[PDB]
Design a protein around this ligand. Sequence first.
Ligand SMILES: *C(=O)[C@]1([C@@H](O)[C@@H]2C=CCCC2)NC(=O)[C@@H]2CCO[C@@]21C
Ligand SMILES: *C(=O)[C@]1([C@@H](O)[C@@H]2C=CCCC2)NC(=O)[C@@H]2CCO[C@@]21C
Ligand SMILES: *C(=O)[C@]1([C@@H](O)[C@@H]2C=CCCC2)NC(=O)[C@@H]2CCO[C@@]21C
Ligand SMILES: *C(=O)[C@]1([C@@H](O)[C@@H]2C=CCCC2)NC(=O)[C@@H]2CCO[C@@]21C
Lengths: 233, 198, 198, 196, 196, 222, 222, 204, 212
Amino acid sequence: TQQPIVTGTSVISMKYDNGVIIAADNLGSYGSLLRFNGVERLIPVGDNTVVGISGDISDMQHIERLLKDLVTENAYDNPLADAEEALEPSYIFEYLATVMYQRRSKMNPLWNAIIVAGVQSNGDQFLRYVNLLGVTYSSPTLATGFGAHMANPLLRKVVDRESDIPKTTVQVAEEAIVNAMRVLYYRDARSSRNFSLAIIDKNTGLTFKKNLQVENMKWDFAKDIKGYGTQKI
Amino acid sequence: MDIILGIRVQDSVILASSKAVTRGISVLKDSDDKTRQLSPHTLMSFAGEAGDTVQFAEYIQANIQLYSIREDYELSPQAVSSFVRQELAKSIRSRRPYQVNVLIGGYDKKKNKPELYQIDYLGTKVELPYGAHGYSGFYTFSLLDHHYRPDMTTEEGLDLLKLCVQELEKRMPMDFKGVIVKIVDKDGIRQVDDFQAQ
Amino acid sequence: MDIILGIRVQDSVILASSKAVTRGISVLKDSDDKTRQLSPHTLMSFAGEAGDTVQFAEYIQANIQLYSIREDYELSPQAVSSFVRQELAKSIRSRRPYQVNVLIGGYDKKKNKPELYQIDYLGTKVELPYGAHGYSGFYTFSLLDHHYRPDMTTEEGLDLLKLCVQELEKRMPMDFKGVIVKIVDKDGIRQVDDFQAQ
Amino acid sequence: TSIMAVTFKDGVILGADSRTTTGAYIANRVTDKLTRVHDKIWCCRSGSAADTQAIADIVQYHLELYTSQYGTPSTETAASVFKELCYENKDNLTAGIIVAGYDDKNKGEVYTIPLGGSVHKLPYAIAGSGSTFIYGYCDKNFRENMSKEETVDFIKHSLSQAIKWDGSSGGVIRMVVLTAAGVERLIFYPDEYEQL
Amino acid sequence: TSIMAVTFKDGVILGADSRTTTGAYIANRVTDKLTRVHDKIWCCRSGSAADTQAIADIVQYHLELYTSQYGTPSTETAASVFKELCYENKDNLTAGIIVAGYDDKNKGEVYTIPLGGSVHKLPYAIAGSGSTFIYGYCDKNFRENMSKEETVDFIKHSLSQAIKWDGSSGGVIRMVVLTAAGVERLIFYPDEYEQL
Amino acid sequence: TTIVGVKFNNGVVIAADTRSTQGPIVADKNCAKLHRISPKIWCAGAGTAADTEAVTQLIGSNIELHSLYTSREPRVVSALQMLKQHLFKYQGHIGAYLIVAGVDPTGSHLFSIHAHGSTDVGYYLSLGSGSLAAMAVLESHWKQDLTKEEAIKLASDAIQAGIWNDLGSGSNVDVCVMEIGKDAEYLRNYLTPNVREEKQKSYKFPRGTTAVLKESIVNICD
Amino acid sequence: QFNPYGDNGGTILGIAGEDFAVLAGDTRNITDYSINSRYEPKVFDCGDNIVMSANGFAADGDALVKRFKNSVKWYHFDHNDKKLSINSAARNIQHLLYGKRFFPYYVHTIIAGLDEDGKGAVYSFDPVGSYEREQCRAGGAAASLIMPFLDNQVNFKNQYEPGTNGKVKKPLKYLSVEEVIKLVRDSFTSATERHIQVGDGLEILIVTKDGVRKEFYELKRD
Amino acid sequence: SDPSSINGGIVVAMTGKDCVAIACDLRLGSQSLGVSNKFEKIFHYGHVFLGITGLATDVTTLNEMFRYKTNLYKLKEERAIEPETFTQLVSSSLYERRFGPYFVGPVVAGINSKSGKPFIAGFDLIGCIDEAKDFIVSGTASDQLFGMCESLYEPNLEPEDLFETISQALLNAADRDALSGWGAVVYIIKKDEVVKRYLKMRQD
Amino acid sequence: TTTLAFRFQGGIIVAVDSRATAGNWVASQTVKKVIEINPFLLGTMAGGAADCQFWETWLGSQCRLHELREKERISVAAASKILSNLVYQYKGAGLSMGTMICGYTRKEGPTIYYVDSDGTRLKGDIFCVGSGQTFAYGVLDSNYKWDLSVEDALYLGKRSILAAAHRDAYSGGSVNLYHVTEDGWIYHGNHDVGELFWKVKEEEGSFNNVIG
Ligand SMILES: *C(=O)[C@]1([C@@H](O)[C@@H]2C=CCCC2)NC(=O)[C@@H]2CCO[C@@]21C
Ligand SMILES: *C(=O)[C@]1([C@@H](O)[C@@H]2C=CCCC2)NC(=O)[C@@H]2CCO[C@@]21C
Ligand SMILES: *C(=O)[C@]1([C@@H](O)[C@@H]2C=CCCC2)NC(=O)[C@@H]2CCO[C@@]21C
Ligand SMILES: *C(=O)[C@]1([C@@H](O)[C@@H]2C=CCCC2)NC(=O)[C@@H]2CCO[C@@]21C
């Protein structure tokens, strides 16, 4: 049993007609101190999988090392490592899920919330969540921490049920997701304005966008607000 | 806790109460009478917290006697019990509540019927053919549920109690030093000085 | 706790032990024998934690019987008690200690003298003319301190115990359902089947 | 929360972030922590929003009645009323307050009332969770008798840093200028102070 | 405690206060928080003196054996050994460590290992109780590729501020310069940095 | 609970969901969280129902008496001052969280009060367990200079976010529009997107199914 | 401190017919007041004509099901592909659960199938292995809302013959799969109305001598 | 510990066609110990009926209080109190004890003597009014009651039918509650008459 | 829960209720509280269902193993001590069980052993375990006779559980009867307390306080 120290906030994601999108800001908080700003919390694995991690950063870095090893190990005595026997997103996930549950069962968890996004070899979209308790679930949209409360409601307005997936384009989806990141910067006190976004499309492959920024914010109306009730100036 | 038992038969109410008073490691007295006569036809038994128990009983006694003098009349059993319930229901929400449970057995001279009332320290009141407080009910209620009859004679009530006391003296961990039994009927309240072997 | 008493008279050791076994709200048994014969001339009484009590007694019994067979000899009372003290003194610092107190009464055939040993669960051992465990000593030691004499006959010991049991049945809050008495002397261990009214 | 008051050549300026939180949630991102207790006597509020509001509302009431009887109150007197309320009720309040006022005889003045209810008159003062991060910066960059533009700049930079490091601070930077000329309201948005 | 490491044009510099406390008592006013784990790989220690010493002693041992077999270790490798010890034993340690080394190929490098055992490579890093007060100052005054004199100046000013506000920091300012030219020890006394 | 307030060019609109819960059990599937303080000053409540309700009526009662005494229309800032000083005095023990809006001689207003007594002002606001779903929508669609119809839509959409995404919210949407020149219009069940489907069977029992021991007539006439 | 447990909500129901058996469960997975998924299957086909569900703490429920399925696999490996009779699966699960008697799988598990005589069968388990064969059993969040209903409509409890003066109990004629599905659906739509953790969807698995079939119905999403 | 789980008991009210019904069990226990099988939890003042679950002493005290208050009301108003009004009297009386409440779960049932309209309402321990059109439940078996009602209930049932429905709801919910049962009583109410029936049920 | 077992001329009578509760919630009214170790041994279950069910079924396996090894029927003393000693190994772990091990062997005759998770092992003639025990003891103590007939003995047990089912909120459902003879135990049905109460009331005249 431990307690997180340096932490990463929300991880939001959703699936569209041809793939899945996933994003996370670049902050590593230390309590109320927004200590580290160049933290990448999106871990690509191969070219069909991206693992988004929130929670304790030291554990994230540990999950990172585990993922690199999975790749190395899979290559060993595997003439099809970059073909029929390459790592599928579901393999990556089942592995992590397994570890998360073993660690909670030993009363020494990896203090994180994880979203594994990607495209299976047969084109299927893959989006599943696993956390420090070893709990797992899937939904057309998935978010961790704060984004669970504020992002999911927005993203679900685009893809409310399975049948909405084929009707959602990369444009619409990336837009929903970019807007959600802005909303989170508005109401989540542990968020950063900079973030990374990644798309895994069954046709265009993996697109990893770094150094994005929340833009087009509304703050002007702030000037019209004074006092807290009766004050006039 | 102490033993507080009550049984309402055809023409009277019988109350049995343990005689022991234990303070920690020792039994200080084995002849304690845990009862107070509220009026010629109303008797109240009680069990609970050390000092509160008697202070409450005597306080109630005082008030009923005062009412009897003022009105030159004896309040019905039902009336005396409602008064007592209210006193406890007040106490339950006061600074330091009275931790006392009581059984009120009386003979209603106007209705010509005996009545048994059970009221715990919270002011919970119920009228029953027989009742008890504490653990006592746990050992005796199955015996009373079995042998009880509305037309029982006072003699049959005493035999049924004796049976209850024997069960208590067999399965209950504590030595309550026997009980003192009192009968309340149309002619008042009398004590059965012979139960040590009836 | 239960009643564990022991008295060493002129030519024997007498052990008295309550017969009640209470589990919470009920007395499950009133004929329990809280003793184990360790060897023909050595008896051990015990009281303490629910399961530990018998498990310990039987464990000790087994070891003494094994020693008796291996050596075709009977260890002296003093020897059996030092063995038992050590077993408890080990237990006191283990993961889950035996919460058992014992009295060991034996007749040393070599010395031709009775011996009474008191050992609590910590492994505290002392040899005495009479002793007890729990609260029992509190009510009885003043009676024993008064009437005890080194040259008492077994009959005088039984009379002194009876006096102790009566004091216990008067001032002690719990009903221990009487005691089972056993005598240990040059001829072995026998039970006084008649103490329910001796 | 990040709040500060700075005296300068022509008077004094108040500044603050516009964030109120309930845990990690931002309950209000456009809060106005700069409260008026008199025409030229304002305060900066940190700590409990409920406590500081109740305190301020009462000080304003007290100063209104004071004015009705003895004329305009000195900044020192306003700070004294705040102090009275904070010290005497220290057990039930969580209020860090900075009082700032402009007098014609005294010019600008700043009194800081920290948690225990003590009073401290200073050339400038900072407070709130975000302040801890700008102690060094402010101590190195503050100068007495700065111009209005320099002072606005000092506050803008100081607070943007406090907002940068403190998750408990954010939104816009509000300022209130108190000089003989009157009362001026200033606001600065994210896109401006973040890249300073 | 106040400690920092800053990379610059010719390498990197380490700095720290010289105070160790046990409550409000100063147990040591001339402590040396700049510890050598290799010829050109040093660390800054904060948190538990006992834990950081034990950690450092072990890293030095590990790097000595590494050198015996594979030659000089990279600064990254030293930071990795520290990390291993801090992460794997996070439940029993209270160690904030900054690793700083000079490589000929990599020049100066700085890795900060905060409480949980995570690693962060940065242009410069600050840590310890006193650091909180200089976050704003440092963020505003740090520049990449500064000269040795400028860097010594940055550290000297930053720390003097940290020492100023933090009762848990004090004494003298120690510095260690790591460049291709070698290893230089610098010390600055109260009478100098206090009036900066 | 999900309650929101949204100002529009010539007034203010407040709305709320209709779910009432005791732990995980839905006690009232159509409670009313919109209360009136005065004809043109309405409240949306969240937190302890008995408290939001009791506090709205107490200040409402006093606001009426104040109105009658001053011969003037009640002002929102007055209900706000009376509410906050009452809540403050009780140190948060009166679990009332309200969004108070309304129009009066000085214009149209929108505020929020928390149990501890702090108040806030804004163009759009929301409180309750649905707070975050609603706010997400508001931060995404609000804009200055909304028309009455846009404000209603925005507010109504914000509650839907809560109804669907928050377990603490559900059932219907209640709205109340307060426009500067007209009467306030209370729209009870403005939206009812959760009608129960027809049961699969009827559970009407054949008469005589229940065993009866004794029967009698109860006397009601004195 | 770290709490190794959580509650994912959900409700499941198992009813044994004369020659069939059903095991249903909503498809909503929650955490506090948030919905994690509106569709996350909770009732599984484990081979050998056995359906199972471990409701409560999902991580535990998943591990258990996964562990049992693997048990069926080895049963075949070690006993010449013999079929695992539901009574045997039951005893097996008891041991799986009791193995963690001192760090339990926080779940209420139920399995359904046909016994060795082709009769419908349901077994419900305790978090620590206690088990019993039953007629019907609801488990989870709305269990308390559904069981009373089932006692009345499935075992005709408290229902007597009209006119017999409650002297003749309503005969226990047994239901068909179609009638049972109706009770199941009504049971959930009712539970959906009063419990905030029940909704989104209902998935039913039906077991007969011909195997396992699945049916799906939507539930309110608020 | 929980004042609301000491004595046990339940109450349920339902609206029908020009009628209302209110029912309750008759148990009064002290934790595991059954003490009385005749503790009725329904009372009436004029044509207004009030059921009360919770701590028995408070159930008794509240009844005595409302009798007292409805008596003075009749003397001053010169008419019997109505369901809607009584409901407000109950609410304000409970809230008056906001920080030292009575541990009860009241339920009001009756028909407005002037409008003929049926009326039922529930309250939490501090007076919050729950005014449902269908049914209202209270007591240690309230979860079970919600389940029974939600399924068994349908609008505009005739008196004879509502009786069957409310009785089955009460009965089967009580049988899943350790602290409820030991007898039951159902009140069928109409503008002109009110019938009270005792039900036959398990006694365990 | 209410469970009892008593010895008499015709062997042993074993009667239990069948209610399962978790708080005030009645989980079941049809639970088995008697484990058939084997054709000659019965075990009663009070306390933790899983604990009793598990270890008593395990006891069955140990008894079987004994009889295979010693080609002789296991004694009640020995079977009870296997359970007793197992349980004692777990003392302090949190096992929760109050149990009666009942059998009729040629060597011992009718034998009842009370075994709980505290490690207590007691041989006796009459035992009642459970939150309803005191009620059953009242009925049993005043009507018990060693010379009771198998018919009357069975009824006494059934009646004693009934008394408890009535007063104890945590007891009820139905009554399960068993008669233990040296040739094995014989099941004597499941009696729903509901119906049993009214029947007994009328025929016996007891439970006068309840209106029927
Ligand atoms: C700042 O101190 C802060 C504000 O919410 C508060 C709001 C209005 C005026 C006083 C200042 N107080 C708090 O409790 C939060 C959390 C950290 O600091 C806040 C942002
Ligand atoms: C600094 O972190 C500090 C030092 O005592 C310590 C000493 C030597 C090397 C590591 C740093 N740690 C402490 O616990 C005290 C109190 C506050 O900070 C210290 C001064
Ligand atoms: C909402 O805040 C909510 C409502 O029950 C309540 C009802 C009427 C007026 C105030 C709001 N309050 C609660 O305590 C429950 C639980 C979560 O939120 C509720 C649904
Ligand atoms: C009785 O002991 C009881 C039973 O639920 C339980 C069920 C099956 C076999 C063992 C006995 N145990 C309990 O924990 C509950 C609560 C009180 O007693 C129960 C009814």
